[PDB]
Each structure stands twice: as C-alpha cells, then as structure tokens.
Structure 1
Amino acid sequence: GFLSGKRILVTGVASKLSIAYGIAQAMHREGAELAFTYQNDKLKGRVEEFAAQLGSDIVLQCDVAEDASIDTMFAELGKVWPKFDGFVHSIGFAPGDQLDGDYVNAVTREGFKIAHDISSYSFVAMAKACRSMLNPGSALLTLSYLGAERAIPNYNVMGLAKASLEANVRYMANAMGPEGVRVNAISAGPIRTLAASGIKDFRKMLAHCEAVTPIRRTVTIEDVGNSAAFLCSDLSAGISGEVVHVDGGFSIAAMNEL
C-alpha cells in the first residue's frame, strides 16, 4: 500500500463508530504500522482489542488536558518508536450546557476556556512534546467542521474553538515546514458518532444535509478514512496548511432547497 514504511500514532478511538476507527482501518489497509492512545481507564480494554485486530500492541494512556500525561506518553512511545512519521488528532470537547439554545445566553467564560483548550490547544501541545521524534516527510492531521466558517444553530462555542484549530493548522504548517513536516485538516460532513449525540437536533442536520448535498448522500468514516490516509502519505507531499472539505460538496452550494 501507499503507507508502507510509515509509523503513525492514532488518538480518539472510542468505539467502532469513531472517525478515528475509520481512519485506522484505512491506514492499516494501506500498510502503515500503527500505535494508539486512550483517554481514561474505562477505554483501555476496548482499544487494546481494536489495536490487536490491526496488528499492533502499542496502546498508551493519554489525557490531553495535562502536560505531564502527554510527556509521559511520548517517553513510553520512544522505547519502541524512537522516531516515527506523524499522528492523527481526533479529539474534541465542550461542556454539554454550551451546546443547546441561543449562543449568547449559553456561552460562559469557563465553557469557552475548556472548549478551546481540549479542541484546539491540545493539537499543538502534542506537536511540542514529540517535535524531535518526527522524521522528515512526517505529516500531522486534525478534524474540523463547517461551524468554524459559518454560524450554525446549537454548535455555539465549538464553532469558535474549531476556527482557532484551523488557524492552528496554518501556524503549525508555517513553523514546521522547514524541517520537513506537513500539517493539514479534514472538514468532515456530519456523521453519527458517540459525540454526535451531544449536538442538539443532530438528526435533522443529517437528514437536511443528505437532501441538498451535491452527491446526495452524507459521507462515511470510510470516505473520511481514505482522505486521511492520503493526507498522511507521501502522495500528498505538495499539500500543507490546508483544510480539505470532505462533506460531499455541501459547503459550496446555496438554496438547493427549491
């Protein structure tokens, strides 16, 4: 496959519906060697089993709210992969009260702080902690959404955190390019995942998107996985600092409705 010879670290696998699970299956199909992280001890056994099905035994705990957890994880990874070729950042969060109802009434100083810290700062916190372990030709990838570029009802402060994340992709690509590292994002269309159930009226989003999207269907974790595999491979060597829309054309149309 087109990822033979690469070693990639994958975050955010919580279940078989996760975008990260889809990305991991596609990368394994194309020949990558993989390593996995897990947020807390309730996820340990599920992730160890997923990793074994994909030929890996490298499974390490990591909570991105804590600098010490990130550092400890990369020091343990270093025992088996002293050098490696990049990582997939598939992590997002905001307190549940932030994501329902009018935006100005729901947002709070603490909710804004947590959303930006876990969904945007954590991407660069990981790069800082593994910078000297990355080979030339490495690639980093994160996942964003259209709520960074447009106001969407109920998405609320997560749209501000994703806008900071997309800027993070550009500043990171500009800083690390000279040493041979690329950094990009995929802006995915709506997909039913565990976290998806926390967005007020996510079921109407899905139905609507299917009706007015140019390809006339919502995208899958297999479509997102194949694009993620391409963006972390040497086939995408000419692409850096980019946000790639993997939403079936939804954002480039208007008023398809009638």
Structure 2
Amino acid sequence: GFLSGKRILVTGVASKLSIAYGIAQAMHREGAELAFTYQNDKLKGRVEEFAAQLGSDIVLQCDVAEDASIDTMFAELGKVWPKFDGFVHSIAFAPGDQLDGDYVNAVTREGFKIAHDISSYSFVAMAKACRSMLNPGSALLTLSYLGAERAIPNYNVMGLAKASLEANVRYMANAMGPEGVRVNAISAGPIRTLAASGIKDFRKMLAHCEAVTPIRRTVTIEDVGNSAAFLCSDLSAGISGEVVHVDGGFSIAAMNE
C-alpha cells in the first residue's frame, strides 16, 4: 500500500464505531505498522483485541490529561520504535452538561477549561513529547468538526475548543515544517459513534445532513479512514496546515430546501 514502511501511532480507539478504528483499519490495509494507546483500564482489553486483529502488539496506556502519562507512553514506545512517522490524534471531551441547551447558560469556567485542555492542547502536548522521535516525512493528524466554523446548537463549548484545535494545526504545521513534519486536520461530518451520543438531539442532526448533503448521504468511518491514510502518506507531501472537509460537501451548500 502507499503507506508501507511507515510506523504510525493511533489513539482514541474505543469501539468498532470509533473513527480512529476506521483510520487504523484503512492504514493497516495500506501497509503501515500501527501502534495503539488506551486511556484507562476500562478500554485496555478491547484495544489489545483490535491491535491484534491489525497485526500490532504495541498497546500503551495514555491519558492526555497528565503530561506524565504522555512522557511515559512515548518513553515506552521508544523502546520498540526509536523513531516513527507521526500519530493520529482522535481525542476529545467536555463534561456532558456543557453540550445541552443555551450556550451562554451551560458554559462554565471549568467546562471550558477541560474542553480546551483535552481537545486542543493535548495535540501539541503530544507533538512536543515526541518531536525528536519523528522522522522526516512524518505527518500528524487530528479530527475537527464544522462546529468550529459555524455556531451549531448544543455543540457549544466544543465548538470553541475545535476552533482552537484548527488554529493549533496551523501553528504546529508552521513550527515543524522545516524539520520535515506535516500537520493537518480532517473536518469530518456527523458519524454515529459512541461519544456522538453525548450531544443532545443527534439522531436528528444526522437525518438533516442526510438530505442536505450534496452526495446525499453521511460519511462513514471508512470515508474518513481513506482520507486520513492519504493525509498521512507521502502522497500528500505538499499538504500542510490544512483542514480538509470530509463531510460530502455539506458545508459548501446553503438552503437545500
């Protein structure tokens, strides 16, 4: 595959529905060697199972909330991969109470803090910790959402954390470009996953993008995987600091009845 000889670290796999899973699966198919990380003991087991199915045995614990967790994880990976070619950042969170009802009433100082910490800072924190481990031609990828560009109901504070994420992509790309590292983000459309259920009225938010999206269907984790495999391959050598929308054109249309 166009990803042979590459060693990429994939994070955020929680179930077969996880987007990171569609990404791992697609990269595996293109010949890359994968590495996985799990947040806690609750997920360890299923991640080891998935890693096995994808011919990998490197499964490390990592909570982007603590710099120590990140340093230990990368120091453990370095034992098998003195150097690798980038990682997929598919992590996000915000207390549930934040994603329900009026934005101004729901948002709090703490919720805001948590959302920005786990969903935007963790991306650079990881890059900082493995910077000297990355080979030239490496790519770093994160996953954003339209909420970053437009104001979407109930998405609330996450929207702000994502705008911050996308800005991160541009500052990271510009900072690491000379060393030969590329940084991009995929702005995926609504997908039926596990964390997608935390957003109030989601079953409807999908049926909307359904009949309004140019391609007349929502994207699948497969659609996203293919785009991430590419954005992480040497085929996208000229793309950096970009946020490409993989939503089937939903964002470039307006008032489709």
Structure 2-normalised TM-score? 1.00
Structure 1 residue 71, shift from structure 2 partner: 0.1
Partner Cα separation in structure 2 for residue 211 and residue 30 of structure 1: 32
Structure 1: unaligned runs, 5 residues or longer: none
Query: What SS class does the counterpart of residue 135 from structure 2 fall into?
Result: strand
Structure 1 residue 212, shift from structure 2 partner: 0.6
Aligned positions of 1:1-258 closer than 5 A: 1-257=1-257
Structure 1 residue 249, shift from structure 2 partner: 0.2
Structure 1 residue 23, shift from structure 2 partner: 0.1
Structure 1-normalised TM-score? 0.99
Structure 1 residue 20, shift from structure 2 partner: 0.3
Q: Percent identity?
A: 100
Query: What SS class does the counterpart of residue 143 from structure 2 fall into?
Result: strand
Large movers: runs of 4+ above 6 Å: none
Structure 1 residue 91, shift from structure 2 partner: 0.2
How many residue pairs get matched? Answer: 257
Query: What SS class does the counterpart of residue 36 from structure 1 fall into?
Result: strand
Partner Cα separation in structure 1 for residue 156 and residue 56 of structure 2: 38
Partner Cα separation in structure 2 for residue 45 and residue 119 of structure 1: 24
- Taking only aligned residues, the RMSD between alpha carbons, in angstroms, comes to 0.3
Structure 1 residue 111, shift from structure 2 partner: 0.4
Partner Cα separation in structure 1 for residue 213 and residue 49 of structure 2: 36
Structure 1 residue 230, shift from structure 2 partner: 0.1
Structure 1 residue 116, shift from structure 2 partner: 0.2
Partner Cα separation in structure 2 for residue 116 and residue 42 of structure 1: 24
Partner Cα separation in structure 2 for residue 196 and residue 44 of structure 1: 21
Query: What SS class does the counterpart of residue 184 from structure 1 fall into?
Result: strand
Structure 1 residue 82, shift from structure 2 partner: 0.4
Structure 1 residue 189, shift from structure 2 partner: 0.4
Partner Cα separation in structure 1 for residue 234 and residue 15 of structure 2: 28
Deviations 1:177-214 (A, max 9, x none): 00000000000000000000000100111001010100
Partner Cα separation in structure 1 for residue 45 and residue 200 of structure 2: 30
Query: What SS class does the counterpart of residue 136 from structure 1 fall into?
Result: coil
Deviations 1:53-93 (A, max 9, x none): 00000000000000000000000000000000000000000
Structure 1 residue 231, shift from structure 2 partner: 0.1
